[PDB]
């Protein structure tokens, strides 16, 4: 047989199709931003009261 | 007139109805044509990346 050279044909940006996360539960949760100075002074914990 | 000659009436390209394949799945798939010189140099294989 001829013993021809064999190359690698790699299509470096033709990614095959890939998975995802929908993030739907965390899209729907309530979102809060305490202020990072206050959290630093508090030691990264805060407290909210409950009704009597 | 008891002994008349009998022919064959053959309608040589008047075909009766015939079966088919519908080719539905291969009509619906993606088609790709990678280039014959490139595939020959590559040994009839090519590669596509997957995401990190």
Automatic annotation (TrEMBL), chains A, B:
Q: Which domain of life is it from?
A: Viruses
Query: What is the protein name for this chain?
Result: Coat protein
Tell me which species this is from.
Answer: Enterobacteria phage CUS-3
């Amino acid at each position: 047989a001829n013993q021809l050279a064999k190359d690698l044909e790699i299509m470096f940006e033709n990614y095959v199709e890939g998975f995802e996360a929908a993030c739907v539960v965390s899209r729907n949760a309530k979102k809060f931003r305490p202020g990072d100075t206050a959290m630093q002074r508090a030691g990264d914990v805060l407290y909210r009261p409950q009704h009597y």
